Amino acid sequence: RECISIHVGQAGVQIGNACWELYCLEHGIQPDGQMPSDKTIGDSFNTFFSETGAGKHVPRAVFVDLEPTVIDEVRTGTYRQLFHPEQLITGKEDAANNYARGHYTIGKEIIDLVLDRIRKLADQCTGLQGFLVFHSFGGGTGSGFTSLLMERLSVDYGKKSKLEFSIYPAPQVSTAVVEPYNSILTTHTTLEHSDCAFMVDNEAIYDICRRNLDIERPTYTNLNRLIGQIVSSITASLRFDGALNVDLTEFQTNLVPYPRIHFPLATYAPVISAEQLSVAEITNACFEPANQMVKCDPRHGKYMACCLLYRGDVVPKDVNAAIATIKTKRTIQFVDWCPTGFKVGINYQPPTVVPGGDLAKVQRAVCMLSNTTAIAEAWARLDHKFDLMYAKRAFVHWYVGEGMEEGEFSEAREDMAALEKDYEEVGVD
């Protein structure tokens, strides 16, 4: 039924602002909150917004960061009118690029408040589904508050599932060396409190724009427009009411065969720059390491569940024979023990792009959600940095500093080692 977004952390927040924005274009809401369509009192898009008061259309979201700065630039540029001054929690002092600070030291204090301001939004909902947690993998509040949130959300909310969108961190447009530590830290405390988790590899997004958009050295608000589009094609199912993927379970009951293995690989279809493609051709893109969403290589790992999420003008009569010659040309690549997939999700709502943005209006777009075993490639490409540093206690002392334990590091690498193991342990028979 209902559906709450949490965005913690500078990265979370700005991905958020850049897709609440794109939600807003899609459903036709003028910034001030009011939409001139016959679809409010308080079905269909009520999944995400709440028809509060007699005029406006507030997002069911809560925004948290530990500096102001970022949350501040929401109560600034129009959209300022869109939320409730309540729903944006800021916290005075930074997390400083450090998990321990985020979880234990600076966290402690703000968590009680957030947790409860969330409970306000769950209370204006008759049968709430779950949460969408947007947050940065590496980096301070994003790894460390997010981790604490989930532990707590997990307690305060029963079944109510939790979907995370993590931002897997990339040397080129980062600033923080200590990154890896933070990701392998959170990811450990975090994973037994999560249900399905879309990783988004900054590098791969930086990649798409440098190749497919002709952008020289792309901005954050460059990257975010792109992610904004992808997320909104994932969440698309539950917003217009979809012919498939129409609830959080039978959306993901689809994707995750095993409790641990959350991490699906996304692939967005026609990224093409303003200043059109065939139903066949865009499908035949989803399987192209370039157009990928996490830098890896799925042609060599096995697929173990595959979704195709179509959006736009499409008759299934096309989709089919297109797939047909995905199998008689390219690399099939299936696991020992699960059918040969392809849940196929048609949504007739044509894809809208941000007005003076980078991309153009497309007729049809595709979205492929694959749970391949090759996405653990980035599980090590991380690990290895973490390994090669901790090996020297490298930056450790900043953690033990704020209050942490030499061994809680040990213990988290332990988890990845073991995970990296399950992902390997799913190949053949």
Binding site: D247, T249, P257, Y258, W337
Partner: protein
């Protein structure tokens, strides 16, 4: 004498909807009111499928169960909408999950008792309730899980009376959920011990009837329900029409089932979509026209009933009927003697001058079970998507406990290719 109908699940319900409006046409009932039609028969056996209420009026004996609003307000908003009595609608609100357990265990038993409550007050009103029939999917929870629950709870209360279902065995091609094999094997088990007849309906068939046999590219859940709707009218007719049978539903079962397990009639139909007698008969006896995905070749017919429809000479009928049993003499069992009886009722359906329906207890149905159990153990393998039930409160071995019940049912059907 009198039958109630339970119609549970998105697949179960949108079947139930089409069924009802097609039979409601044959009798001729206004989207609300009563009779409008030059025929006069109809109403003899309307007693059976319609409990009648005040004013003119006729209202079905139907209960509609779902575990979410969505598909219920589809019926009420669609074709023969406001025909069903307002509070015969059992709402869901919650999840369904496309998961057996939620529907048989948690969110199901959550409701259930409210369903029993409508059924108990239609059947207790009903003057000589002969039995219930049910419609529903087999891969996917609200139908397969709740309904298999329903029926277990429907017996016990009503041992007594005979149970009956059109169930839709799911295929790998043309489906939504990775898991359905799990969902199916769990209800198959349930059915095989609690129903008295069970019309098997493959969507591998239903869809195949459309693209090999109909030149229809993009098969909806529409023109595909259309078949089931028709085939269901077929099977009912002679409890609901002539007076040339008389079809106790019990009698009907006793004479159709040799062995108490194995009540798995694969059906089939005559003409198709939106007819001579010979070319009607060697058509309801072709596989390329069966409702299960089998092939009534590898597998011999235990018992076989057909019912014919059209003001035509049945002096032709038994003569063609005979002919099939000799042109295909091998493929009926010998040890039950007059094991293929047919009868004829002369009031045709929507469209179509002449038509036929084939009810069929063929051990070739083993061919369907085996197909599911094949992709089931292929998944219960390294115990895959199972963790969605692990956590729901189901047992590790409870799957294996019903995987086995099925591999019996396989090699009993195999054990009945026997001897004179």
């Amino acid at each position: 004498r009198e039958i109630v109908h339970i119609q549970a699940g998105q697949c179960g319900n949108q079947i139930g909807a089409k069924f009802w409006e097609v039979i409601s046409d044959e009798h001729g009932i206004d989207p609300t009111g009563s009779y409008h039609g030059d025929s006069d028969l109809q109403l003899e056996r309307i007693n059976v499928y319609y409990n009648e209420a005040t004013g003119n009026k006729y209202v079905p004996r139907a209960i509609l169960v779902d575990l979410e609003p969505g598909t219920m307000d589809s019926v009420r908003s669609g074709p023969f909408g406001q025909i069903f009595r307002p509070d015969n609608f059992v709402f869901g609100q919650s999840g369904a999950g496309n998961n057996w357990a939620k529907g048989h265990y948690t969110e199901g038993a959550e409701l259930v008792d409210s369903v029993l409550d409508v059924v108990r007050k239609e059947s207790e009103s009903c003057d000589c309730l002969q039995g219930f029939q049910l419609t529903h999917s087999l891969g996917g929870g609200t139908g397969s899980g709740m309904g298999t629950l329903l029926i277990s709870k429907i017996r016990e209360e009503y041992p007594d009376r005979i149970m009956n279902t059109f169930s839709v065995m799911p295929s790998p091609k043309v489906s939504d959920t990775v898991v359905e094999p799990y969902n199916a094997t769990l209800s198959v088990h349930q059915l095989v011990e609690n129903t008295d007849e069970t019309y098997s309906i493959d969507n591998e068939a239903l869809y195949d009837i459309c693209f090999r046999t109909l030149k229809l590219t993009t098969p909806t859940y529409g023109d595909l329900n259309h078949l089931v709707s028709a085939t269901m009218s077929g099977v009912t007719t002679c409890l609901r029409f002539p007076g040339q049978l008389n079809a106790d539903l019990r009698k009907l079962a006793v004479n159709m089932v040799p062995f108490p397990r194995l009540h798995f009639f694969m059906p089939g139909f005559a003409p198709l979509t939106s007819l001579t007698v010979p070319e009607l008969t060697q058509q309801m006896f072709d596989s390329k026209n069966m409702m299960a995905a089998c092939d009534p070749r590898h597998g011999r017919y235990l018992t076989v009933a057909a019912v014919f429809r059209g003001r035509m000479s049945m002096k032709e009928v038994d003569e063609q009927m005979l002919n099939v049993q000799n042109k295909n003499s091998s493929y009926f069992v010998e040890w039950i003697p007059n094991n293929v009886k047919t009868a004829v009722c002369d009031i045709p359906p929507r469209g179509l001058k002449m038509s036929a329906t084939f009810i069929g207890n063929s051990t070739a149905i083993q061919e369907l079970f085996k197909r599911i159990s094949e992709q089931f153990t292929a998944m219960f393998r390294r115990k895959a998507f199972l963790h969605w039930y692990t956590g729901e409160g189901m047992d590790e071995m409870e799957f294996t406990e019903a995987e086995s019940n099925m591999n019996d049912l396989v090699s009993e059907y195999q054990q009945y290719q026997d001897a004179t």
